């Protein structure tokens, strides 16, 4: 395939363009009234959306170069998103901002490095800001007051999701299932997640989510790496008889033995899945372990003579829900006997008093909250299934917010908080003009969100956010209500941590391309 | 088919439009602050990076004859890399600066061949100015101080390469492995290296590293030519039945057991490789039975009467780690016995005694240090395994370097020892007048690499190197830090030999270029 | 289908437009500093050359006619080199200066019957003068002498030669191995060379050579023309299980056979290449039988009542090496009995008493020197494969320098003795007007190598040829020294054979160009 | 040649200050105020040319380095004066 090469202004006019186009289209969707854009289906009439995630992943462009500024703020923003839960749209808008009055600043003869490391500058100050005008979340209280919110002023979904990190932790594993009755269930099951994603984007069954949930799945513990399909075949053949989804666990699985799994299970005959093992080196053979004492599994080891050809349904383990996304496997209420899992956290509990070196002790603290700490999955409860399956869905986003929250407390979610920053550190500049130049673009690019919000509500976005910078602390402008006061109060925020993933990355995003002198595609 | 066919000027302006374009895009990354270049990918988004070498390999131009300009310097800088371990940018763009002046001149009415010889002329006072220049590194301190530098300012991985050193010695067997735990472990283990490549690209399981990585691998030791796919098949299933890798050293492989064997293993039933005996004639054959001894395996031979099909598992030779590149193959901890390993050595050690030639008793001498001297492996300890193979990668890159300091010295890394040399000699006077030509534009053009970091840095190259020529020895600046010193003691330097093998390199396809009459390809 | 069909001038402007093009590209890499040229391949990227062979081999034109003067050019050329060894890019040179100048003349008016012979009469008495000025080879002193200047200033290479005329004889046959070991070998074994071809071009295994080795191969000697792939079956199948490579010795194979052969040889089963036997009728069947004494193998006589499908490996003569070019095959180390073989030299030397004619005792006599004389092969030593291979190919070439030297002796090889011979023979006239034209092209056309040679280096060639034309005798212009003086004592000469045949084959294809009035191709 | 390299390097310094956010009548002005300051450093700087040889090397540098002018030029104001007339 033949490289088509652009250099400097022809090269980066055309990332703005891209960038723009995918801006624009994702932009409108941002505001609580945010502006709502037409996706065709292939199948069926066309698709109409609020969410900027959905446009944002329904978006290419024909012009290579273009497509790769837009593509490129699009992995960007995305990350945000995985690592914030929220704030995927807000990156974008901030990443044009940034990038469009940046890359004037370079085509104005100024120098692109020092601009990007006005922004950088800028941006780093910024956050601290942020983290002053943050309010912490820990107790119970800011807990469920933060997770009704996201829920859209629910208080009960605040008040489970406070209960569940009450019963095991901040920084225990939450599950969501679906409701066998009326009421609203959390309980308390033996489990783990690990942060292990999918050997394959085919094998997942369920979209929207992007993550496989399988339902009382056999699993399959090995010690070695799986190029061959010859070792499934007595296993597999097995699996498919009961009509029971298999899970396994490995060093990693080759595609000779991976590709026929994928093909078989797409729209195939035994729709299973593999995910690689936890830890590694010394760290996974005895973390396999605790699984297979998890779930009453047994362990396959190339080392210890036992082949994964020569295996029978017995050394499968079991558990009654797993759900594996892009990076992560969970498993829920494994089979494993009571004594031999609790006993196997005393066995580790004594390991513990050794404390040779202060990674040994917390590396192996760390098994055993996987272990002892389990995992507390919350079933929704609900009237009709249409209700149930909606509700369970705010719930998954109250979740991500709450752990957001947690982990760095909240802002002003009104995109006032950026508007707040940029006040506060107005007077700073750089020794270079060009660094002053790129201080006020980053500063100036954060008002941006806020603006959007206002226009895609059909309100003046000069006049509001003029008045909001007229205010201090959390003081804001709400575009549901009409009304300014403090948006924290009010009932709108973002989590402090997405707001700094968001504007961080679109700095990010945009001094690369303030940067970048070259690109290469291939042929129209 | 027919072919298109420019010769004279008309060829060789397209080759320089060509090489521009290759150069153009690879030297904006060389300097520390590197501009960023965005590759295409047919699927989604651009890729961002600063590296040189995943930017050439990409490029290919769609106009015939110009590619062949792009392609010959892409080959040629590919070599110095190939043979040094870095100045793959650095060789691209000396050969752009070198070939335009130059190319000019030859366009000019100037006779070619002479502009050649001026050239070299310079190129070769360069090379020793540069032998002069290079500071010796043989201690220990010298070579963990390379290592550290290149290991980006890490002092533990300068340690391990100096002890490696240390043991086996400079021209001894170093490996990297992944590492057990969280420290870095060093041991001396059985094992041999020889200087034989893969027979098939196919064969590689490391796309980034180029080689084929084995583990715990049976190891088939014949003494024919193997044509054939037959012979193999009783151990070929058996091996797979074990559930191992399997590596063949014999003559040679044709395409008809060659392209199975390939087909074999990609995507396919058993993946296995298979590399070229060591030696020739009387070398082999005493060679191949050092590696059975080793590897604690059986040789099979034609003129014995033994057979590939009659044999079996026992009849091959075993080693933890075995390692396939472009032209080395090398194994790790090898079987076979103590007793069979060092009496062997004995016989050797013995054989040494006859010295009817200078020419066996240093090829015997030779075969007791890969039979004797055994392999220093690395672990790299980390902790987490992302990191793991990280420090792993550096690790390599520095072994590298110090491999190619210890063999020439070191020299300053800034661009700068290219500025040093060509100030040297600025008085050196060819025979013909166009020879002058070709002086003035070898100089001339090794101030290109620091002017481009320079240029990189957004700084001004015409200032830069006009002071880095005021000064004296090492002297120069650094682009990272934005000051003036001695280059190699602010942690900045090239090993001698990459720097003279990227000039040579780029002055080699620079003259050849320049006596190049004649070029013929396919039609549009 | 329907075709393209030209007259006259229209025909041969094409033909002449062909020629420059495959003359103008090849005529460049001529001269000691020839300037290299540059082809591109499917597989990869390109390399440059200065061998006018490999630069022939790839043009082929876009023009049908002219593709067909190149063509034709090109099987002239190649044809010098089969009955040289060298000057393929000589006899080119020589042809577009003769088809040049003598197609002019066709197209002014002139007769182009008359133009050929006028041509044929200044080559008739060039080659008289080539006879005189060419330098005898026939001792030991020069046989080393010329051997070693064609090696390229090796004197070891060009001993062995005559050491091996020595041995065998100047008219015996010399073989090249590779070397088992550091010496260099030459030493004679039982063996037999014939005139016969390979059935296919697709047999060929060694693509740079042009011909088939075969190591140790089985030996099929058989009385009939083939004409059914049935009857190959159970030796064909018999030596699949041996592994070694078939060799086969019939009156003929028809397309049935053969095309089967070809495609089972190439991406097959078993690899094997046959040939004509050598003689015919009643002289076949003594001369296959001398084949079969050699090898020990069993000649299939289908007068006797004796069939292939009948026959086992015991009836498979074997020889250590066999190898086959366009239209010769030889055969190294045949295993057969030193007692049958000399007992069947016996029967030949007792059946010369019979001579009832000259031709009989001689073609008789022929026999017994083919046989009895046996096969001289050299080993070529080296200190590794690289040298070893590369040294082995120098070699072969000046093997076929020697043989060529000795059958016409030598004459100076820098083109100046086209021009010693064309400055002799200024007065030579024809009949008619017309004749006068055709010589004055053919002696002026001479001058064209030497001119080539002083052009590829840089210098002007009408000053070097009007004082090396000053000169007698050998005295010349050695262009790689920049000196004037005896080309032969200087180390530059080419064979009188080589310098004969590249004339000779250049005026043969000029002249039938010259008469040819039309041509036919199929349409673009 | 020169008045226009000036007008060269004052564009584009000033074109690429435009792109800086400046308002442009005010670029003029600051522009204007370096201009009337520059020239009064010019009146200073300025020596009196009196000298035949001063006269010479200014119609030789004038001439793109070429003495035979400004010693033929040098001769012929002295002689014709101050009001004098040369064509
Ligand atoms: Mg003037």
């Not at 901030?94 to 100024?110: R, S, W, Y």
């Not at 299934?385 to 109250?398: Q, T």
């Amino acid at each position: 395939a033949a490289k088509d090469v652009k250099f400097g202004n022809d090269a980066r006019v055309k990332m703005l363009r891209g960038v723009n186009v995918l801006a624009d289209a994702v932009k409108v969707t941002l505001g609580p009234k945010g502006r709502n854009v037409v996706l065709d289906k292939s199948f069926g009439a066309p698709t109409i959306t609020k969410d900027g995630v959905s446009v944002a992943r329904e978006i290419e462009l024909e012009d290579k170069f273009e497509n790769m500024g837009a593509q490129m703020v699009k992995e960007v923003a995305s990350k945000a998103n995985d690592a914030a839960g929220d704030g995927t749209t807000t990156a974008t808008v901030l990443a044009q901002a940034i990038i469009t009055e940046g890359l004037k600043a370079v085509a104005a003869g100024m120098n692109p490095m020092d601009l990007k490391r006005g922004i950088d500058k800028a941006v780093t100050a910024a956050v601290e800001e942020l983290k002053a005008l943050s309010v912490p979340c820990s107790d119970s209280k800011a807990i469920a007051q933060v997770g009704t919110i996201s829920a859209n002023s629910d208080e009960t979904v605040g008040k489970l999701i406070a209960e569940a990190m009450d019963k095991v932790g901040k920084e225990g594993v939450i599950t969501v299932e679906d409701g066998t009755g009326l009421q609203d269930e959390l309980d308390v099951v033996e489990g783990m997640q690990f942060d292990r994603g999918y050997l394959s984007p085919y094998f997942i069954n369920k979209p929207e989510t992007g993550a496989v949930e399988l339902e009382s799945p056999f699993i399959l513990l090995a010690d070695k790496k799986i190029s061959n399909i010859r070792e499934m075949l007595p296993v597999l053949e097995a699996v498919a008889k009961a009509g029971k989804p298999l899970l396994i666990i490995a060093e990693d699985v080759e595609g000779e033995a991976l590709a026929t799994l994928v093909v078989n299970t797409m729209r195939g005959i035994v729709k299973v899945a593999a995910v690689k093992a936890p830890g590694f080196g010394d760290r996974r053979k005895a973390m396999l372990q605790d699984i297979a004492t998890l779930t009453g599994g047994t362990v396959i080891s190339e080392e210890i003579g036992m082949e994964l050809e020569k295996a029978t349904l017995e050394d499968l383990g079991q558990a009654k829900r797993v759900v594996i996304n892009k990076d992560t496997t969970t498993i829920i209420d494994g089979v494993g006997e009571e004594a031999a899992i609790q006993g196997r956290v005393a066995q580790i509990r004594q390991q513990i008093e050794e404390a040779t070196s202060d990674y040994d002790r917390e590396k192996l603290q760390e098994r055993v909250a996987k272990l002892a700490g389990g995992v507390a999955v919350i079933k929704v409860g609900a009237a009709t299934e249409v209700e149930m399956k909606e509700k369970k869905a705010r719930v998954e986003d109250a979740l991500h917010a709450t752990r957001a929250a947690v982990e760095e407390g909240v802002v002003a979610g009104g995109g006032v908080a950026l508007i707040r920053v940029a006040s506060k550190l107005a007077d700073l500049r750089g020794q270079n003009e060009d660094q002053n130049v790129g201080i006020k673009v980053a500063l100036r690019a954060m008002e941006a969100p806020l603006r959007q919000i206002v226009l895609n509500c059909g309100e003046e976005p000069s006049v509001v956010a003029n008045t909001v910078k007229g205010g201090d602390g959390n003081y804001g402008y709400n575009a549901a209500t009409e009304e300014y006061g403090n948006m924290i109060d009010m009932g709108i925020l973002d989590p402090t941590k997405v707001t700094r993933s968001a504007l961080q990355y679109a700095a990010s995003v945009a001094g690369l391309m303030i940067t970048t002198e070259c690109m290469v595609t291939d042929l129209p």
